[PDB]
Amino acid sequence: SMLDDAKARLRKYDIGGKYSHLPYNKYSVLLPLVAKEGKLHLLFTVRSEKLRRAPGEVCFPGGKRDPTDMDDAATALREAQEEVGLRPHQVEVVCCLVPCLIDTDTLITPFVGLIDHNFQAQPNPAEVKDVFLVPLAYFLHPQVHDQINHIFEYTNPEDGVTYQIKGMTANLAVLVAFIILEKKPT
Numbered sequence: 001s002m003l004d005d006a007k008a009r010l011r012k013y014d015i016g017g018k019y020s021h022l023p024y025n026k027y028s029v030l031l032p033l034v035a036k037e038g039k040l041h042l043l044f045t046v047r048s049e050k051l052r053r054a055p056g057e058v059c060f061p062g063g064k065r066d067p068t069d070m071d072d073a074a075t076a077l078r079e080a081q082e083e084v085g086l087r088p089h090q091v092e093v094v095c096c097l098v099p100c101l102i103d104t105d106t107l108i109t110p111f112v113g114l115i116d117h118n119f120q121a122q123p124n125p126a127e128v129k130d131v132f133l134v135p136l137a138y139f140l141h142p143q144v145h146d147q148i149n150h151i152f153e154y155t156n157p158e159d160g161v162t163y164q165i166k167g168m169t170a171n172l173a174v175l176v177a178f179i180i181l182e183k184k185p186t
């Protein structure tokens, strides 16, 4: 099946807890995979305009590890619940992808999660201005704009709204698309 195939692919790139004990400032993100209309999608947030870091930017759910978290996956799930109402029974964490090093002292660990088909986002407006889906296949043929760094523009055909996706968030989306969608018979 589509979902068993995606999970099998993802597991081959799992690094597990290999880098998780290193003494960094630690953040986790959840890369949430949603199956709709027979295709996989990634779920993104738009950060609230009143957040201090990166207001109004497109971002995966996530945040800083705190002492309650059993592990880095727990960070991702706790933050996703706070931000978009995703409950732990609604997500299967499949793997941990390559972590992202930033600012010399920070390590961001991405987890891919399969999201239940009955999940509907309940975003906390203090943190999240918007939640939207992008088909995973978009990231194989994105609409690129050069700002010099590359920016993806995705227009939701449901409503004509265009979102800009860039940086780590864009990079991770492409990685997931490659992992899951490469070398597939039609």
Ligand SMILES: COc1ccc(CC(=O)Nc2cccc(Cl)c2)cc1
Binding pocket: 027, 028, 029, 045, 046, 047, 048, 051, 059, 060, 061, 062, 063, 064, 083, 102, 108, 127, 128
């Ligand atoms: C630069 O390092 C990071 C990048 C992304 C994150 C994930 C994140 O913060 N997500 C979020 C999405 C909407 C609202 C809120 Cl409050 C948070 C954390 C660290």
